Amino acid sequence: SDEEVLMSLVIEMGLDRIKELPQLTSYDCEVNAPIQGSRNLLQGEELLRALDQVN
Amino acid sequence: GSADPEKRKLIQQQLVLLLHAHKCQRREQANGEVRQCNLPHCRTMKNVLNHMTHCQSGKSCQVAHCASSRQIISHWKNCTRHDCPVCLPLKNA
Ligand SMILES: [Zn+2]
Ligand SMILES: [Zn+2]
Ligand SMILES: [Zn+2]
């Protein structure tokens, strides 16, 4: 995911426009964004390494 | 539970913002302790990312966007769904 792609998604999704950012709930996230059952809710600095184009 | 299409849109938007902020912050950590990006909520999600690295409250955590961000990130890492209504924009684009 090029930062070029991420900037394009940010602008296509409206995130460059001033907004209220809703505080989603862990529940609404566990429902609409389920972990495998891996049950591996990343913590520590590994949680940042994930974001380095992980598949 | 039951999937709401609107929540899935707020979720993918928070994911794009988390991914931007990380890359933004990586581009900062090499270029000095900058913190110059003025994208809406970018500073916010950078501070969220640094919170949850050293955070240990886990699900008990009420700091805005920590619990949710940690769940969304963990999903995106392992999401191998072809069809995923959250990730499909990012994975494929
Ligand atoms: Zn930024
Ligand atoms: Zn926390
Ligand atoms: Zn997904």
Cβ-defined contact of A18 to B23 (cutoff 8 Å): no
CA–CA dist B64, A4 (Å, integer):
28
The whole domain housing B69 covers 1-93
* Burial readout A10-26 (b: 16 or more C-beta within 10 A, e: otherwise): beeeebeeeeebeebeb
> Tokens 């394009």 label which residue?
A8
Nearest to B93 by CA among A10, A49, A21: A10
Cβ-nearest to B59 among A16, A26, A54: A26
Q: Within 10 A of B65 (CB to CB), how many other CB atoms are there?
A: 24
Amino acid (1-letter code) at residue B80: T
> Count of domains in chain B?
1
Method: X-ray
In whole angstroms, give the CA distance from residue B69 to residue B90.
16
Q: What is the resolution of this structure in A?
A: 2.0
Beta-carbon count within 10 A of A37 CB = 7
